[PDB]
Design a protein around this ligand. Structure first.
Ligand SMILES: NS(=O)(=O)c1ccc(-c2cnc3ccccc3c2)cc1
Ligand SMILES: [Zn+2]
Length: 257
């Protein structure tokens, strides 16, 4: 099955998921000089004060911090969006080296990691229905650069030892995702896809221009996770990013001048 290795990595996915060669695939390079300022773009509305985190899971390609999405608790609105999107999970993509790891790039620059806060459009009733719709998901993407530690990330880092291998999960209640956001909510936005199989073309991408800083030790502990399950040969969970895909007939808009 699919993964990030030489024999099952992004270059192979199209054989099981032909949409990998589609017209609105993610991630993309964000050419900041070609992205046009759109003065009609509204500010983002990130309402996370009532977020209810539940669990953290090693799913064999990343770790997901999952939320209660059975009610409107943590929601994304505004920006390019119509309607209300419920937070269901966030996860990261990261590198084996500080100089790579993000999925989106900015003027071809790669960050050490990228955070994805995944939300689904409540008008479709549940997550599984939403991913079948071209406006089903809104993913808030946030770059991570290596520098000073991010205090609000440390509770995530601390628990990774307990979910080292594929299929392990741990209680993760009372985590506040507001501690993962940068100061500014200026963003770029474009229509795209899931960056992992099934690669469905259901995502409005909202990528924050301001990265967050994490410490070398924080990302180091990301890289001690495992792709494999317990009892199998150890494969470090590193370089779980898909590279930039052709922009094709899309325009990236900027919320800011
Ligand atoms: N990396 S990303 O674009 O933010 C992202 C990628 C994939 C999913 C996801 C994962 N597994 C699925 C299984 C069945 C249906 C939809 C799925 C979506 C959810 C979010
Ligand atoms: Zn992702």
């Amino acid at each position: 099955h699919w993964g990030y290795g030489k024999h099952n990595g992004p270059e192979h996915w199209h054989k099981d998921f032909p949409i990998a060669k589609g017209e609105r695939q993610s991630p993309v390079d964000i050419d900041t000089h070609t992205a046009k300022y759109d003065p009609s773009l509204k500010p983002l509305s990130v309402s996370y004060d009532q977020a209810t985190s539940l669990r953290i899971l090693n799913n064999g390609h990343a770790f997901n911090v999952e939320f209660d999405d059975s009610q409107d608790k943590a929601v994304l609105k505004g920006g390019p969006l119509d309607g209300t999107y419920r937070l269901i999970q966030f996860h990261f993509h990261w590198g084996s080296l500080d100089g790579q790891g993000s999925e989106h790039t900015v003027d071809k620059k790669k960050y050490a990691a990228e955070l994805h806060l995944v939300h689904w459009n409540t008008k479709y009733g549940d997550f599984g229905k939403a991913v079948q719709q071209p406006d089903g998901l809104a993913v808030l993407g946030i770059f991570l650069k290596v520098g000073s530690a991010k205090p609000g990330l440390q509770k995530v880092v601390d628990v990774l030892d307990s979910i080292k291998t594929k299929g392990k999960s741990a209680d993760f209640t009372n985590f506040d995702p507001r501690g993962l956001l940068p100061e500014s909510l200026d963003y770029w936005t474009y229509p795209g896809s899931l960056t992992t199989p099934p690669l469905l073309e259901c995502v409005t991408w909202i990528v924050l221009k301001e990265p967050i800083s994490v410490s070398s030790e924080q990302v180091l502990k990301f890289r001690k996770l495992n792709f494999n399950g317990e009892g199998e040969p150890e494969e470090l969970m590193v370089d779980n990013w898909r590279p930039a895909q052709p922009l094709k007939n899309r325009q990236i808009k900027a919320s800011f001048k």
